[PDB]
Amino acid sequence: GDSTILKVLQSNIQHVQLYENPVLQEKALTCIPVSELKRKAQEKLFRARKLDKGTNVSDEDFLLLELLHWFKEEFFRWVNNIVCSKCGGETRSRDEALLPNDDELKWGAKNVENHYCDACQLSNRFPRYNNPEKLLETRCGRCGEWANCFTLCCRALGFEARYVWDYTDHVWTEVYSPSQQRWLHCDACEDVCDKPLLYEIGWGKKLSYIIAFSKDEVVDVTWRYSCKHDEVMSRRTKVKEELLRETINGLNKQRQLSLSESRRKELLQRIIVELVEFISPKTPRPGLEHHHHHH
Amino acid sequence: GHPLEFLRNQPQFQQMRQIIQQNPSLLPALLQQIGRENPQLLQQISQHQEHFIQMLNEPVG
Ligand SMILES: [Cl-]
Ligand SMILES: [Zn+2]
């Protein structure tokens, strides 16, 4: 477990349990316009269903697309550098970070950035809050904060949802579709759904490990986000595959001991779908797909 | 093996092998899901059913 990757499995398992507090869930819903999100979703399903060309259904799937949209356009803002608190002007990052006074420790900030104003000769503090409850107040950050808060919200609305950690310093969410009987990629920071090749093929990222974390499961979902499986294998130099899989298997077995027989059985039937996806790498289409930039 | 040998040591297929070994009854469901998601892989499995089944049933740690 002395590799960093195995240490982060443990931290993320813990962290994800936070979304299960029903008061935190309440408070999250205190923030979401849940009826209007659901009223708009009913309407798109109404019209989708007029032309039966629209098959299966999509319904809580339509709702999911309303959540992504609102979070991005109404709820949360991006931070590059915060404005100066004295003069309102631009600030610039100091390479040397600040130290979390005390209240910044209370809300899970280990890192605090110094956003300096030269005109005022003034340090402005940007804490990197890790407690999702704090983020429902601040409503801003970079993609850590966005994914953290968005995953809480999904769970608050009764979606099954994973917090997804990419070893190359990005994070996002996955949400289950009972209609389609599969997990869907969701990136709130980017307003994207069900486009898992965005990172490798759209951003040209060289991926290694992507691990999903939920109340029920830890899952190595790497293979969903790549069509260059050999290349990804060449960067998986951080831990033995054996040890990674035994650790995840161990953690699943341990954590699933307190679910029902029927539920464990369901999870097994679902895992067949994922694993078949993982041995079914897809074909990039940079000439066709707006978000595809690489062969 | 035949064309499907490159599955053998893939970490996700090692995972699949483990699951099918612990849950023999999932074999029909696995083959049916393969047919849906990867029909060309199913076509390959149908030409060499023994080799595929041999691979699924080889233990891994
Ligand atoms: Cl995609
Ligand atoms: Zn200033």
Backbone angles phi, psi at A183, to 5 degrees: -80, 140
DSSP label of B9: T
Residue A269: inside a domain: yes
Q: What is the CATH number of the domain that holds A126?
A: 2.20.25.10
Out of B11, B18, B34, the one facing A276 most closely (by C-beta) is B34
Nearest alpha carbon to residue B23 among A220, A177, A260, A275: A275
Q: Do A229 and B10 touch (CB under 8 A)?
A: yes
User: What is d(CA B40, CA B4) in angstroms, rounded to the nearest whole number?
Assistant: 11
Q: What is the CATH number of the domain that holds A61?
A: 3.10.620.30
- Tell whether A147 and A123 lie within a shared domain: no
Q: What is the CATH number of the domain that holds B13?
A: 1.10.10.540
Nearest alpha carbon to residue A234 among A260, A208, A265, A263: A208
- Tell whether A145 and A181 lie within a shared domain: yes
Relative to beta strand A170-177, strand A182-187 is antiparallel
Angle between helices B27-37 and A261-278 (to 10 degrees): 40
Q: Do B30 and A276 touch (CB under 8 A)?
A: yes
Three-class secondary structure of residue A236 per DSSP = coil
Nearest CA in chain B to A281: B38
Nearest alpha carbon to residue A187 among A219, A211, A162: A162
Q: Where are the beta strands (DSSP E) in chain A?
A: 77-78, 92-93, 112-117, 122-127, 140-141, 161-166, 170-177, 182-187, 192-193, 210-213, 218-220
- Tell whether A250 and A106 lie within a shared domain: no
Note every long-range contact of A132-139, with CB atoms under 8 Å and residues 24 or more positions apart, other chains counting: A132/A18, A132/A19, A132/A24, A132/A28, A133/A24, A133/A27, A133/A107, A134/A107, A134/A108, A136/A27, A136/A28, A136/A31, A139/A75, A139/A76, A139/A77
CA distance between the termini of chain B: 21
Asked if A165 contacts A8 with a C-beta cutoff of 8 angstroms, the reply is: yes
Nearest alpha carbon to residue A284 among A275, A276, A294: A294
Nearest alpha carbon to residue A278 among B15, B31, B60: B15
Instruction: Specify the experimental method.
Output: X-ray
How many CA atoms, within 13 angstroms, populate the side-chain half-sphere of residue A112?
17
Nearest alpha carbon to residue A290 among A224, A205, A201: A201
Residue A294: inside a domain: no
- Residue A194 annotated in active site: no
What is each CA distance from A46 to A39, A72, B31, in whole angstroms? 11, 24, 35
Domain containing A99 equals 81-130
Resolution (A): 1.9
Amino acid at A95: D
CA distance between the termini of chain A: 36
- Tell whether A113 and A253 lie within a shared domain: no
- Residue A102 annotated in active site: no
- Tell whether A124 and A175 lie within a shared domain: no
CA distance A223 to chain B (A): 8
- Tell whether A200 and A217 lie within a shared domain: yes
DSSP label of A84: P
What is each CA distance from A267 to A81, A88, A172, A218, in whole angstroms? 43, 52, 22, 12
Amino acid at A238: K
| H or E element at residue A274 | helix A261-278
Three-class secondary structure of residue B36 per DSSP = helix
What is each CA distance from A257 to A171, A252, A260, B10, in whole angstroms? 28, 8, 8, 28
Amino acid at B44: Q
- Tell whether A231 and A95 lie within a shared domain: no
Q: How many domains does chain A have?
A: 2
What is each CA distance from A283 to A201, A230, B1, in whole angstroms? 10, 14, 25
Backbone angles phi, psi at B53, to 5 degrees: -70, -40
Give the distance (Å) from ligand 1 centre to CA of residue A284.
8
Residue A246: inside a domain: yes
Residue A291: inside a domain: no
Report the side by side order of strands in the sheet with A161-166: A192-193, A182-187, A170-177, A161-166, A210-213, A218-220
Backbone angles phi, psi at A92, to 5 degrees: -135, 145
Residue A153: inside a domain: yes
Asked if A193 contacts A177 with a C-beta cutoff of 8 angstroms, the reply is: no
φ/ψ region of A232 (left if φ > 0, alpha if ψ in -120 to 50, else beta) reads alpha
- Residue ranges of alpha helices (H) inside B1-61 are 11-22, 27-37, 39-47, 49-56
Asked if A69 contacts A191 with a C-beta cutoff of 8 angstroms, the reply is: yes
Domain containing B6 equals 1-61
Backbone angles phi, psi at A98, to 5 degrees: -95, 170
- Tell whether A269 and A170 lie within a shared domain: yes
User: What is d(CA A177, CA A58) in angstroms, rounded to the nearest whole number?
Assistant: 8
A269 touches chain B (CB under 8 A): yes
Hey, which residues does A185 pair with through a beta bridge? A174
Q: List the structure tokens of A238.
A: 């951080």
Residue environment code for B41-50, b if the CB has 16+ CB neighbours within 10 A, otherwise e: bbebbeeeee
User: What is d(CA A193, CA A206) in angstroms, rounded to the nearest whole number?
Assistant: 21
